[PDB]
Amino acid sequence: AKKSVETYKIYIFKVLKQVHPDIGISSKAMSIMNSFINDIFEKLAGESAKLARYNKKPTITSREIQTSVRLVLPGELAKHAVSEGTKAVTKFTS
Amino acid sequence: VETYKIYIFKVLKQVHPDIGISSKAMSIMNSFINDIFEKLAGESAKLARYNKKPTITSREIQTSVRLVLPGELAKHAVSEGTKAVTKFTSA
Amino acid sequence: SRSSKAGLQFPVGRIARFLKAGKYAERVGAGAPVYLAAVLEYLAAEVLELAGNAARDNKKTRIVPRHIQLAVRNDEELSRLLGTVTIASGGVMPNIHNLLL
Amino acid sequence: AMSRSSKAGLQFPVGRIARFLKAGKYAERVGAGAPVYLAAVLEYLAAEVLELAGNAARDNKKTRIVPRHIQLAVRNDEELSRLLGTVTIASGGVMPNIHNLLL
Amino acid sequence: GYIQGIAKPVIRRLARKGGVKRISGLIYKETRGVLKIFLENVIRDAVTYTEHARRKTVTAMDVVYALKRQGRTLYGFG
Amino acid sequence: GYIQGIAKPVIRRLARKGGVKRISGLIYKETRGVLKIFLENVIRDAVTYTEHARRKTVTAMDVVYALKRQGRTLYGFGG
Amino acid sequence: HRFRPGTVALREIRKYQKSTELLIRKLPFQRLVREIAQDFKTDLRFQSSAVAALQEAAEAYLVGLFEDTNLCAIHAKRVTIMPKDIQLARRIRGE
Amino acid sequence: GTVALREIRKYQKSTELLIRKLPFQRLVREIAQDFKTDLRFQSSAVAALQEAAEAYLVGLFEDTNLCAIHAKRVTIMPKDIQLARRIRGER
DNA sequence: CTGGAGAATCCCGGTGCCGAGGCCGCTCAATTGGTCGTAGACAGCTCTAGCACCGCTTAAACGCACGTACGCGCTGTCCCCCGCGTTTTAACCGCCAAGGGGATTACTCCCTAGTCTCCAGGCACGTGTCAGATATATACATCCTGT
DNA sequence: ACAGGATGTATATATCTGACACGTGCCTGGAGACTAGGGAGTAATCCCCTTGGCGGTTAAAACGCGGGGGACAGCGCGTACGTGCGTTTAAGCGGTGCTAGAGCTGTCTACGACCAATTGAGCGGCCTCGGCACCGGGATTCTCCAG
C-alpha cells in the first residue's frame, strides 16, 4: 500500500456534473482546478487569520470568513460569494 | 503598547555614540523591525507546515533568513545568528 | 453530515479539519467551515461553468487546460483574481496588435 | 538571574521574541534556539540600517537621524533597496534623479 | 465631483518631483483618474477592515493594513 | 556555459508566441541573460527549500513553492 | 521676460526633489477622501492620522507613476509626457 | 512579412512547450550546480521550471512588443526589453 | 486595380490508442453524545477626539499675453532581418541496467510545554534644556543677452 | 567663446523654541526550578525511480544568398505649453462649541475544545471502451503578381 494525498477531485467532479450534465474533465484540468481550490482556500484562511490577529480575537467565525471573502475576491464575485455563504449558514443553523 | 524603542536606541548608541534619533525615525525603525520579524516568522511557519514538523528550531529560522534576505545580507545575518546561538548554547 | 445539512457538495468536515490543523487560529467557529465551503463551491462552479462553455464552443466534451485558460482570461473578474497565476500547458490568448497587421 | 539577552551577548529582547513566536501560533512548538537566532538577525538588520542612516546624517552635518536620512540609507545601498523595493517611508522624500536628456 | 479640487499646479509639482520636465495639457485629467482609482481601492479595503471591527471611525492602522494588502507598505504610522 | 544552448529559432518562436512581428539581431543575447537571471532566482529558492528538508532530490513541490514566492504561482503541478 | 526656455522646470525639479513635505492641498484631498468613502459606508469619520497616511500613499504612488511615465516618454525620443505614456506605464505594471 | 503573422497565429493557437527539453535540462542542472553540488532533479520539477520560464519569457516579450509599438516601431530592440524590465520593477 | 494560381487552410471520414470513468476492499477520519471551561455577547460607564462654524491673512490658485521650443508629418537612404533552399548536427525515441536515495518502521531519549515563585526591566508620566528652526546680514556661483 | 549684470544659493549671527534625553514611580511577564511526555534523532531495510549508456533515425538548427521595407537622420512648419504678471479665492491659522463613539470594565451564558465509540466516505487499484489525436484526401480561402 501507499500513502494517500487528500484532494478535492471528487467534489470538483460532482460540481462539474451538477453544472454541465455531460462534459467530463481530463486529469490535467482536474489537477489545475484542485490547485486553484487549494490556493483560494489558503488565501482566505490566511486573511482570516490576519483579521483575527489584528483584533486580538482568537476565534475564526463566519464573520471573519465573510470579511476575508470581501477583501480577496473582487466585486461581483465577492457579492455572489457572500450571498452564497450567508444562504449556506442560514440553512445550516436551522 | 509594546515596541522596540529602547532596544533600537541601545543599538544606535552602540554603533554611533554621538548621534540621536528623532521620534519619526524611531517609529519607522520600530515598524521595520516588526515587519521583518513578521516576514521571518511567517516563512518559518510555512517551512514547518510544509515538512509537517510542529517545531521551529534554529534551522527553520536560518532557512527563512536565507529565503527572505538577499545576498550579502542573508550571508551576514546567517553568520550572526550562528554566532549568537553558539555563544548562547555554551553559556 | 454537515455537507448534507448545508446542501453543499464540498467537504465541510475536511475544511474544518484543515482550518484546525493549519493553526490559522487557536479556535474555529462552528459556522466558519460551512461558509468557507460555500465560497469554494461557488468559485469552483463559476470556473467550471465558464470552462464548459468554452469547451462547447470548441466542439469538445472534455475540459482541458486550454479551455480553463480561455475561461479565466476571457472573464474579467476571474482574470483580475488570477492576474499573476500561470496555468501550465494553457497557452496564451490570441492577440495581434492593430499596427502589426 | 542573567537574562537570556545577556547570555546571548545581544541587545534585543530574546524573551519578548520567544513570547511573540509562541503567542502568534506560528507553530505548535518553538525551539529554545529560535528566539536567540531571531533576535540576532533583527539586531543585525537594525544595526545595519542605523549605521547607514547615521553615515548619511554625518554627510549632511546633522547630528539627529530623521526620516530623510533613513530614506537615503535604504535607497542608496543596493541590497537594502532590493529588500525594501516597494516600501514607502513617510516624509522621507525621494532620491535626486534627473535624466541626462532633460538637462 | 470633488476630484476637480486637485488643481493643475499641484499635479505639476508632483510631476516635477518625479523628474518630468514638460507636461502635456491632457495629462491632468488622466492623473486625477488614476489617483481616484488608487484612492478608491485603498479606501474600500480600509472600509472593509473597519466594518469588520464594528467601528465607524477609520483609523490609521486600518489604512496601513489596507496599503499593506496592495503590497505598498507604509512605515511611520504604527 | 550551457546558456548558449538555447537556439535562436526557439527564441524566435517564443517571441512569435507573444505577438512580435520583427526581432532585432541583438535580442537573442538579452533574452538569454534575462532567462538565466530568472532561472537562477527560482533555482536558488528551490535548492534552499530542498536543503531544508535534507533531501538531495529537487521535487516538483519545491519548484512550485519557489515560484509562489516570486508572485508567479504555478497551477497544474500540485500544491 | 528673463530666462524662459525651461530652466525654471529644472530648478523646480531640483527644489522639489530636495524637499520632503507634503504637496497635495490638505483640505481638498480630505474632501476627496470623504467623498470616495461615502459610497462604501455612509457616515464615516476619519482620524487625522488616517487622512495623512492616505495622502502619503497617494503622493508616493503618483511620484512613482510619473517616474515611470517619464522613462516611457524619454524612450520614445520625446520630452513632454502624454496620456498614452501613462496608459502604457500602467499597462506594463500590471496593476 | 506574412509568414511572421502566420507563425504568430499558429503559435498562439498551440499549447505545447517550445523550449528544447534536453538543452533546457542541461542549463537547469548547470545553474543548480553552483548552489548545491551533486543534485538530482525530478522530471516533473524540470517540467515545472520549463513551463515557468516559457510563461515568463512570453510575458516579457508581450511587454517588449508593447514598448516597441509605443515608439512607432515594429522591430523590438534590446532597449525595449531593458525598459520593460525597468518598469516592471524586476530591475 | 483584376483575374489566374499556388499554398495554406479547414471539413470529412476511417484507425487505433490509452486515459477517463466505474466498481471493488477497507481504513481512518467524520459524526454523535456528553462534559467542562471561558471567550464573547451584552449592558453600562467615562471622556478623548472628531466634526462643525466663524473670523482674519495671504499664499497660492486662476485668467491671460506671448513667443519660443518641441511635436509631428514628410523625404531620402541604406542596412539588416525575413524567406527560403541546403547541409550538417544532435535531440529524441526505445530499451537496459545500476544503485542512490526517498519512504516507512522501531527504540531511545532529550528537549520543550505547563506550573508556581519572585521580582526587576519596561512603560507611563513629570522635568530641563540643548539641538532644532528662523530672519537679517553679506558673500558667491550661475544663466541671459550682447559682444 | 567672454563679460557684465541680475538672480538664486550659501554662509554667519543672534533669537527663540519644544522634542528629546533624563529622572521617578509602578507592575506583569521574564527567569528559574520542577514535573512529565512525545517529537527528534539514529539505524535499518526495501525498492522506485533518476542518471547514465547505447544506437539509429530524422526533426530541425545553421548557413547563406536576395532584397525590400523600415530605422533612422534630416528637414520643415505649426501650435501649445512654459514663464511671467495682475487678479481673485478659498486654504490655512486660531479659537470656540458639541457630542459620537473609542475605549474600557463587569457579568453571565452559549459555544467550542476534548474524550471515546461507531461506521461509511473516500482512496488505491484494477479494470473497460469511447473521445480524441492522427492521417489522408478533397473542397475552400488567402497572397501574390503579371496584365
How far apart are alpha carbons B25 and D50 in whole angstroms? Answer: 10
Q: Which three cell numbers stand for residue E22?
A: 514638460
- Statement: the CB of A76 is under 7 Å from strand J: no
- In this structure, the strands spanning D29-30 and C27-28 are unpaired
Assign residue C59 a region (left: φ > 0; alpha: ψ between -120 and 50; beta: otherwise). left
Domain count, chain C: 1
CA H18 / C1′ J62 distance in Å: 19
- Statement: the CB of H78 is under 7 Å from strand I: no
Is B61 a member of any domain? yes
On whether the CB atoms of residues C60 and C67 are closer than 8 A, the answer is yes
Q: What is the 3-state secondary structure (H, E, C) of chain A?
A: CCCCCCCCHHHHHHHHHHHCCCCEECHHHHHHHHHHHHHHHHHHHHHHHHHHHHCCCCEECHHHHHHHHHHHCCCHHHHHHHHHHHHHHHHHHC
Rg (CA), chain E: 15
- In this structure, the strands spanning C27-28 and A24-25 are unpaired
Domain assignment of residue D74, given as a range: 4-102
Was domain H2-88 assigned CATH 3.40.50.970?
Answer: no
Domain count, chain A: 1
G94: three-class secondary structure by DSSP = coil
Tell whether C13 is within 8 A of chain H (Cβ): no
Q: Which of H16, H42, C43 is nearest to A34 (CA)?
A: C43
CA G78 / C1′ I72 distance in Å: 11
> Distances from the Cα of E19 to the Cαs of E48, G16, G78, G86, in angstroms?
36, 9, 14, 14
Q: Give the angle E17-E21-E26 at the CA atoms, nearest 5°.
A: 95
- The identity of residue A1, as a single letter, is A
Domain assignment of residue B59, given as a range: 22-90
Contact E19 D98 (CB under 8 A): yes
Resolution of the experimentally solved model in angstroms: 3.6
Chains G and F are touching, with contact defined as 3 or more CB–CB pairs separated by less than 8 Å:
no
CATH number at residue D12: 1.10.20.10
CA F58 / C1′ I103 distance in Å: 16
What b-and-e string marks burial along E5-34, b requiring 16 or more CB atoms within 10 Å of the CB? bbeeebbbbbbbbbbbbebbeebbebbbeb
CA of G17, closest CA in chain E: separation in Å?
Answer: 5
Considering only the beta carbons, identify the residue of H5, H15, H65 that sits closest to C91. Answer: H15
Residues of G (30-89) placing their beta carbon closer than 7 angstroms to any atom of strand J are 43, 45, 80
Considering only the beta carbons, identify the residue of F17, F18, F74 that sits closest to C86. Answer: F74
Tell whether C79 is within 8 A of chain A (Cβ): no
Question: Locate cell 551577548: which residue?
Answer: D9
How far apart are alpha carbons H60 and E8 in whole angstroms? Answer: 35
Burial class (CB in 10 A: 0-12, 13-18, 19+), C60: middle
Tell whether D90 is within 8 A of chain E (Cβ): yes
How far apart are alpha carbons B3 and E74 in whole angstroms? Answer: 17
On whether the CB atoms of residues H19 and H53 are closer than 8 A, the answer is yes
Question: Locate cell 535562436: which residue?
Answer: F8
Q: Give the angle C38-C42-C48 at the CA atoms, nearest 5°.
A: 140
Tell whether B27 is within 8 A of chain E (Cβ): yes
On whether the CB atoms of residues H27 and F39 are closer than 8 A, the answer is yes
Contact H77 F31 (CB under 8 A): no
Q: Which three cell numbers stand for residue C28?
A: 474555529
CA E15 / C1′ I63 distance in Å: 23
Sign, CA torsion F30/F34/F40/F46: negative
How far apart are alpha carbons B23 and B42 in whole angstroms? Answer: 28
CA of A5, closest CA in chain F: separation in Å?
Answer: 10
Residues of E (42-71) placing their beta carbon closer than 7 angstroms to any atom of strand J are 55-57, 59
Tell whether F77 is within 8 A of chain A (Cβ): yes
**Which DSSP category does C98 fall into?**
T
Tell whether C21 is within 8 A of chain B (Cβ): no
Which residues in chain E are contacts of D67 at CB distance < 8 A? 76
Q: Please report how the helices C32-57 and A27-54 are oriented relative to each other, as an axis angle in degrees rounded to 10.
A: 150
Which residues in chain B are contacts of E78 at CB distance < 8 A? 27, 31
**Which DSSP category does D3 fall into?**
-
What residues contact G37, with CB distance under 8 A and at least 6 apart?
E43, E46, E47, E58, G44, G46
Alpha helices in chain F (DSSP H): 8-17, 27-53, 60-69
Burial class (CB in 10 A: 0-12, 13-18, 19+), C53: middle
On whether the CB atoms of residues A42 and A30 are closer than 8 A, the answer is no
Burial class (CB in 10 A: 0-12, 13-18, 19+), H5: middle
How far apart are alpha carbons F53 and F29 in whole angstroms? Answer: 36
- Statement: the CB of H43 is under 7 Å from strand J: yes
Q: Give the angle F62-F63-F68 at the CA atoms, nearest 5°.
A: 100
How far apart are alpha carbons E8 and E26 in whole angstroms? Answer: 11
Tell whether E76 is within 8 A of chain B (Cβ): yes
Chains H and F are touching, with contact defined as 3 or more CB–CB pairs separated by less than 8 Å:
yes
How far apart are alpha carbons G11 and E19 in whole angstroms? Answer: 11
**Cβ atoms < 10 Å from Cβ of E40:** 14
How far apart are alpha carbons H84 and F34 in whole angstroms? Answer: 12
**Which DSSP category does D30 fall into?**
E
> Distances from the Cα of B91 to the Cαs of B82, B84, B85, in angstroms?
14, 11, 10
- Statement: the CB of E22 is under 7 Å from strand J: yes
| Class of domain G7-93 as given by CATH | mainly alpha
Contact E15 G49 (CB under 8 A): no
How far apart are alpha carbons D29 and B56 in whole angstroms? Answer: 6
Domains, chain E: 2-69 (1.10.20.10)
Contact F77 C88 (CB under 8 A): yes
Tell whether F76 is within 8 A of chain C (Cβ): yes
On whether the CB atoms of residues F14 and H35 are closer than 8 A, the answer is no
Q: Which three cell numbers stand for residue F6?
A: 538555447
Contact G13 D98 (CB under 8 A): yes
Q: Which three cell numbers stand for residue B87?
A: 555563544
Tell whether B31 is within 8 A of chain E (Cβ): yes
- Statement: the CB of A21 is under 7 Å from strand I: no
Name the B residues in 49-88 with CB < 8 Å from any F CB.
50-51, 59-60, 63, 66-67
How far apart are alpha carbons D54 and D63 in whole angstroms? Answer: 8
- Statement: the CB of D33 is under 7 Å from strand I: yes
Q: Which three cell numbers stand for residue G28?
A: 481638498
CATH number at residue A84: 1.10.20.10
| Chain J bases closer than 7 A to any CB of the protein | 7-9, 19-21, 29-32, 39-41, 49-51, 60-62, 69-72, 80-85, 90-92, 100-103, 111-113, 121-125, 131-133, 143-144
What residues contact A12, with CB distance under 8 A and at least 6 apart?
A25, A30, A33, A34, A37, C44, C48
Contact A71 E51 (CB under 8 A): no
Determined by cryo-EM
Rg (CA), chain A: 16
On whether the CB atoms of residues G46 and E57 are closer than 8 A, the answer is yes
Is A1 a member of any domain? no
Chains A and G are touching, with contact defined as 3 or more CB–CB pairs separated by less than 8 Å:
no
Is B45 a member of any domain? yes
- Give the number of residues written for chain H: 91
For residue A50, the chain E residue with the least C-alpha distance is: E65
How far apart are alpha carbons G35 and G42 in whole angstroms? Answer: 10
Alpha helices in B1-91 (DSSP H): 5-15, 23-50, 58-68, 72-90
Dihedrals phi, psi of C85, to nearest 5 degrees: -70, 135
How far apart are alpha carbons A52 and A60 in whole angstroms? Answer: 7
Chains D and B are touching, with contact defined as 3 or more CB–CB pairs separated by less than 8 Å:
yes
Tell whether C73 is within 8 A of chain H (Cβ): no
Q: Give me the residue spans of the domains in chain G.
A: 7-93
Q: Which of G84, G52, B73, H86 is nearest to D97 (CA)?
A: H86
Q: Which of G64, H65, H71 is nearest to E34 (CA)?
A: G64
Is A23 a member of any domain? yes
Is B8 a member of any domain? no
Render H39-83 in DSSP notation, one character per residue.
Answer: -EE-HHHHHHHHHHHHHHHHHHHHHHHHHHHHTT-SEE-HHHHHH
Tell whether C98 is within 8 A of chain F (Cβ): no
**Cβ atoms < 10 Å from Cβ of E36:** 17
How far apart are alpha carbons C49 and C69 in whole angstroms? Answer: 13
How far apart are alpha carbons B18 and C17 in whole angstroms? Answer: 56
**Cβ atoms < 10 Å from Cβ of C62:** 11
**Cβ atoms < 10 Å from Cβ of C50:** 19
Is A3 a member of any domain? no
**Which DSSP category does G24 fall into?**
S
